């Protein structure tokens, strides 16, 4: 047989996977907080916003943005350059606990 | 010196007093939390979304949009024909402590 | 060879397929402005907020506003026990140009 195949990964540094990784990170500490949660959280991200909202029932107490501006710079968008910063982007908060 | 003299009032129901309401009820909330946290949060409200923001240093922690709904049905906004749902409206908070 | 398959699939009232119709009707708007253009829209749905924003290089003039009530309002999303308005929702376009 002759047959091409093909797939395809991005870096961390794009955009989807910079909401995916900022959601789960979210996830992360909180399900820490209490591992019986429940947690739905969506992150959209634009120019320059991070939005993020879901449900969540626990007991636990996170900060979104803090989590949020972490994970962002440890992908190391950092500079207005790189076209985004923790340091800049305004984060919302949309979840409903 | 004969003379008109006008002033004027807003109910609690108006929107402009709607956001000092959600303001200072987090406010309240917070200080009860933390006699000492420092605060300074901002509130928007437009047609079907509420936004909270502001930079809050404290040790406390609050459910923001939890808050808000409990006002704004307090104030009675509890229906689509009413104009405004609490149950309805989404909850921004952009505060960052 | 005897096995069980399953699919699945949501009515237009789900939310995700309720955001998705709202992009396209947007690009719909748009390509008949403009058949040219280059749209890429996407859109977030929360409880009482629908945001909506996109790169969108055109000649094109079109109200975001009016595009998603009329698509909203047409699916039926009409009252607030429903769980969502039409006309109580907030609409939020970051679109770029």
């Known amino acids: 047989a002759k047959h091409l195949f093909t797939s395809e990964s991005v870096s ?3 955009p989807d996977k ?4 900022i959601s789960d990170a979210v996830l992360d500490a909180i399900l820490e907080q ?3 949660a429940r947690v739905a959280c969506e992150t959209y991200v ?6 993020v909202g879901g449900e969540i029932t626990t007991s636990a107490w996170v900060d979104i943005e ?26 919302l908060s949309a979840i409903g606990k």
């Open 12 to 14: 961390e540094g794009h």
């Open 18 to 21: 910079i909401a995916d990784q």
């Open 34 to 36: 209490d591992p019986k």
């Open 46 to 51: 634009k120019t320059g916003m991070v939005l």
């Open 66 to 91: 803090e989590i949020t501006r972490n994970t962002v710079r440890e992908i190391g968008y950092v500079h207005s350059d790189m076209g985004f910063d923790a340091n800049s982007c305004a984060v």
